[PDB]
Scaffold this active site. Structure first.
Site, short mmCIF file in Angstrom:
data_model
loop_
_atom_site.label_atom_id
_atom_site.label_comp_id
_atom_site.label_asym_id
_atom_site.label_seq_id
_atom_site.Cartn_x
_atom_site.Cartn_y
_atom_site.Cartn_z
N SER A 222 -2.58 -0.81 -44.22
CA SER A 222 -1.96 -2.11 -43.96
C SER A 222 -2.31 -2.64 -42.59
CB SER A 222 -0.43 -1.99 -44.04
OG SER A 222 0.13 -1.33 -42.89
N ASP A 223 -2.10 -3.94 -42.41
CA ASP A 223 -2.04 -4.46 -41.04
C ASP A 223 -0.75 -3.99 -40.35
OD1 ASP A 223 -3.52 -7.53 -39.79
OD2 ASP A 223 -2.78 -5.77 -38.66
N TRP A 224 -0.61 -4.33 -39.09
CA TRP A 224 0.44 -3.66 -38.28
C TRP A 224 1.84 -4.15 -38.68
CZ3 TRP A 224 0.27 0.12 -34.48
CH2 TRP A 224 1.46 0.28 -33.74
N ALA A 226 2.73 -4.60 -41.66
CA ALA A 226 2.63 -5.42 -42.87
C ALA A 226 3.02 -4.72 -44.18
CB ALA A 226 1.19 -5.92 -43.00
#
Ligand SMILES: OC[C@H]1O[C@@H](O)[C@H](O)[C@@H](O)[C@@H]1O
Length: 778
Positions: A222-224, A226
């Site tokens: 995932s993104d941070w 997310a």
């Protein structure tokens, strides 16, 4: 392959250790995994980012911006760029770089447009694959990001993008599909939703498209912060990135807990609501990449040392090959003879260079030369080269007069601590446009002034100083922030009043009247996290360039701008050279281009709008930025130059545009079908001028008369860059893959060939297409 057998030997705890990034014990990078020592699986480390390795407290090569690399139109430049990144990451104890980014350039305001490649999928695909092969061939894993439709910063944490299937398959996906097929080790899923589910919790995206259809072999992170829930592991997400961080965490303290893929995931496995098979599969994907990259050898390959000289050389060459000469009237450039020996240099980035964009991709190099100094060197000892600031970014500390309570300038916080910092009022002496300047060191701060929010700290550059339109009287001012572990936070609050800007402008104008040639550097402030509020140069730089060009008829603008920018003063200038954010060797490259030691050869990878509100997403909040967390990509495939062509709108500058110090002629194209049903297009190119140079031959294909689905008026279907000595001709081959002759048929759910007699055009920009052929596609 050993990865399945090793995971079969692991405990549930050992498997779960791979599926959430923890903090770096060394406190430099984005994520760390502990591995499983008893099974010979080492630690794993990941750092940002797309233009060089970003590590807190450790410098590395700051390469030119991704957009500058793409603007080379040269896959070999992407290979070199990637090799430098991979070697730096390996040398600096990392195992992965979190890049490249390859989202389409859709929104001219998009904050991160500098950090990606193009508005055209072919250019994005070619640049991404050549860079990934370069990084991975140097031993470092990549992370194609942000999958998918992360084309703006505004509300990226919450917005859902509804995008029709053909638009996804033809515009946003191709670079990700090509990266998957080239063996990118990992993907990072986007903050935004896509078609009704968070990208990081979207099974159709991460399992059906990415795996069932494209065959991706790696893992998805995932993104941070997310990750949308623990169940996302059953929807194609393999690894959670992010933890809660008040700010910095001292070395020797534990990593803060994972939210969804740690304790909660263990609970869900042990109660049967998430199958253990999903954790096993995710760990196998990660460990399988570690095996492929040689990390499971009993004795792995030794890490390299940095090659600083080779990294400087590649950074220079990329900037020299991706800069775009936009305007050049009456051979104003190159600088030569007396015109090159009497110069007024103006603009803050001539002395404090604009090396990288802002955000997680920001890289601090060991050093970076100033353009003023490389211009002085090149002009020669006999030359007169003066310097004036022209555009101030800090101005002066705001008078205590105007602040209630007074703000204690300077030291804010002792290493480690966070807090509120200020709660008060700013009094403005007169209606006007003010820069409000925030200069943080040793940590981060967030200033809220009325409705405006200003972030300041290392990835946001030395100073943050937006131009704000303020009325006379009071305005609410609040500050908060946090210190890094080693360093107290210190913070200064300044302003540049209208009067102070006029005085700095006047000083620059005087220097311009005195010199033969005026070279004005101008910059923009593209950042991760928010989009640009408008397409103009920030601050008072428009007024500066207009005043300087009124005073000196030989005004050259050097742009250090990350994307499109408006140019109301264009006709008053004689040349405009776009250096993008040119990396650590940008000043050397800029002087070389200005003097014609190198001949500009970059081309635009995006269209520059002619007006603030005339572009593919303007005038419709449901298209940009969204309303109630919902947007729809109403332009469909007609984005970038495809939109300008559909709407019969002339952009400021068109896709594929870029001038040279020499001239080129092209023959008519000859076309032959290839054994796979693609096309081989041949064009003889002659350098008809007096200087060696490179040209990019571009091929565009018109719509099929046999297709009723949406089609672009013209589609870039291949290109090839060529180097020619003065007087030299070469016959250039432009390959067109079969896929380029196809469209996505949202009935058959598959690619279909657009057959029939179609217009093939060749030339040197989307707007300068001299050659043509009729191609019967079948
Ligand atoms: O720094 C870690 C991550 O931060 C996020 O804010 C960005 O969207 C990612 O591109 C980056 O890799």
């Amino acid at each position: 392959s050993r990865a399945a057998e090793l995971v079969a030997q692991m405990t549930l705890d050992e498997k779960i250790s791979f599926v959430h990034w923890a903090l770096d014990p060394d406190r430099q990078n984005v994520g760390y995994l502990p591995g499983v020592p008893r099974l010979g699986i080492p630690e794993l480390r990941a750092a940002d980012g797309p233009n060089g390795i970003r590590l807190v407290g450790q410098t590395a090569t700051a390469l030119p911006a991704p957009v500058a690399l793409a603007s080379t139109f040269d896959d070999t430049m992407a290979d070199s760029y990637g090799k430098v990144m991979g070697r730096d990451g390996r040398a600096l104890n990392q195992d992965m770089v979190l890049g490249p980014m390859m989202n389409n350039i859709r929104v001219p305001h998009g904050g991160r447009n500098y950090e990606t490649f193009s508005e055209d999928p072919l250019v994005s695909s070619r640049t991404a694959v050549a860079q990934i092969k370069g990084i991975q061939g140097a031993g470092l894993m990549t992370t194609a990001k942000h999958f998918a439709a992360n084309n703006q910063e505004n509300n990226r944490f919450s917005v859902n993008a509804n995008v029709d299937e053909q638009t996804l398959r033809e515009i946003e996906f191709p670079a990700f599909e090509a990266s998957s097929k080239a063996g990118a080790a990992s993907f990072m899923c986007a903050y935004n939703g896509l078609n009704g589910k968070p990208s990081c919790g979207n099974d159709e995206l991460l399992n059906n498209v990415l795996r069932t259809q494209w065959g991706f072999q790696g893992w998805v992170m995932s993104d941070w912060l997310a990750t949308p829930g623990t169940d996302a592991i059953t929807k194609g997400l393999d690894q959670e990135m992010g933890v809660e961080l008040p700010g910095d965490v001292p070395k020797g303290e534990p990593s803060p807990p994972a939210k969804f893929f740690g304790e909660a995931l263990k609970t869900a496995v042990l109660n049967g609501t998430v199958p253990e098979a999903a954790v096993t599969r995710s760990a196998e994907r990660i460990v399988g990449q570690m095996e492929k990259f040689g990390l499971l050898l009993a004795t792995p390959a030794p890490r390299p040392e940095r090659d600083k000289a080779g990294a400087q050389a590649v950074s220079r060459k990329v900037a020299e090959n991706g800069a775009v000469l936009l305007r050049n009237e009456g051979q104003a450039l190159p600088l030569a003879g007396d015109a090159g020996k009497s110069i007024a240099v103006i603009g803050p980035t001539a002395v404090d260079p604009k090396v990288t964009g802002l955000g997680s991709a920001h890289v601090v190099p060991d050093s970076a030369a100033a353009p003023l100094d490389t211009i002085k060197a090149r002009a020669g000892a006999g030359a007169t080269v003066t310097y004036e600031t022209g555009e101030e970014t800090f101005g002066t500390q705001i008078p205590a007069g105007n602040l209630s309570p007074a703000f204690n300038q300077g030291h804010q916080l002792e290493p480690g601590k966070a807090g509120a910092l200020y709660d008060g009022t700013l009094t403005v002496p007169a209606d006007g446009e003010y820069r409000i300047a925030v200069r943080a060191t040793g940590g981060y701060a967030t200033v809220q002034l009325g409705s405006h929010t200003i972030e300041a700290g290392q990835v946001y550059g030395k100073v943050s100083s937006p131009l704000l339109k303020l009325t006379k009287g009071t305005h609410k001012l609040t500050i908060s922030g946090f210190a890094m572990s080693a360093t107290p936070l210190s913070l200064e609050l300044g302003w540049v009043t209208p009067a102070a800007a006029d005085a700095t402008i006047a000083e620059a104008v005087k220097s311009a009247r005195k010199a033969r040639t005026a070279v004005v550097f101008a910059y923009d402030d593209g950042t991760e996290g928010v989009d640009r509020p408008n397409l103009s140069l920030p601050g008072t730089q428009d007024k500066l360039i207009s005043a300087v060009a009124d005073a000196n008829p030989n005004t050259i603008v050097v742009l250090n701008t990350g994307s499109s920018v408006l140019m109301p003063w264009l006709s008053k200038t004689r040349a405009v050279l776009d250096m993008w954010y040119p990396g650590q060797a940008g000043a050397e490259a800029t002087a070389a281009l200005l003097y014609g030691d190198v001949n500009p050869s970059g081309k635009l990878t995006q269209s520059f709008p002619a007006a603030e509100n005339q572009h593919a997403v303007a005038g419709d909040p449901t298209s940009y930025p969204g309303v109630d967390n919902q947007q729809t990509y109403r332009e469909g495939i007609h984005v970038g130059y495809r939109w300008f062509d559909k709407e019969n709108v002339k952009p400021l500058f068109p896709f594929g545009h870029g001038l040279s110090y020499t001239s080129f002629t092209q023959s008519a194209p000859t076309v032959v079908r290839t054994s796979t049903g693609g096309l081989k297009v041949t064009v003889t190119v002659r350098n008809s001028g007096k200087r060696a140079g490179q040209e990019v031959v571009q091929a565009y294909l018109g719509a099929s008369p046999n297709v009723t689905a949406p089609q672009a008026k013209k589609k870039l279907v291949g290109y090839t860059k060529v180097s020619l000595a003065a007087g030299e001709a070469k016959t250039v081959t432009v390959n067109v893959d079969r896929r380029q002759l196809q469209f996505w048929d949202a009935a058959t759910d598959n690619w279909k060939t657009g057959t029939g007699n179609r217009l093939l055009q060749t030339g040197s920009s989307s707007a300068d297409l001299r050659g043509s052929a009729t191609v019967n596609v079948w």
